[PDB]
Ligand binder design. Structure first.
Ligand code: CU1
Length: 139
């Protein structure tokens, strides 16, 4: 069967902030921007490894997140409504009140991955907008 997952976006966190999938699992994932502010703000959902932060040669208490070096969805074919196929640099960016539902098969990329939002120059990420995805080997 296809397993349905939802990740809700709020300022500035995901619910849930942990998720576990198995290699080979059929996933239908809905990302929903439930931004609660006046006005509601855009949010990103990107899954990857190896945090990249701003350079400037001076030390920081919090690094200003800018992206992931390794994108979990690299190579991964996805279906969303009428469209099927891999999506280059796949990321989900949504305005407040918008959602996006897509399906795929979990690739053989076992271990720990992270999800995050890099909008507003890393400020959301700094405010806690990140989560952990564990990928288990096939049952
Ligand atoms: Cu965000």
């Amino acid at each position: 069967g296809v397993h349905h997952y939802t990740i809700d976006e709020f300022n500035y966190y995901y619910k849930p902030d942990r998720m576990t999938w198995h290699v080979g699992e059929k996933v239908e994932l809905t990302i929903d921007n439930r931004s609660q502010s006046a006005p509601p703000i855009a949010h990103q959902f990107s899954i990857g490894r190896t945090l990249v932060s701003r350079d400037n040669g001076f030390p920081k208490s919090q690094a200003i997140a800018v992206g992931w070096k390794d994108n979990f969805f690299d190579g991964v074919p996805i279906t969303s409504g009428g469209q099927t196929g891999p999506v280059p640099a796949f990321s989900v960016s949504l305005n407040g009140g918008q959602k996006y539902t897509f399906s795929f098969v979990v690739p053989n990329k076992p271990g720990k991955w992270e999800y995050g939002c890099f909008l507003q120059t890393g400020q959301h990420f700094m405010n806690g907008m990140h989560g952990i995805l564990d990928i288990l080997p096939a049952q």
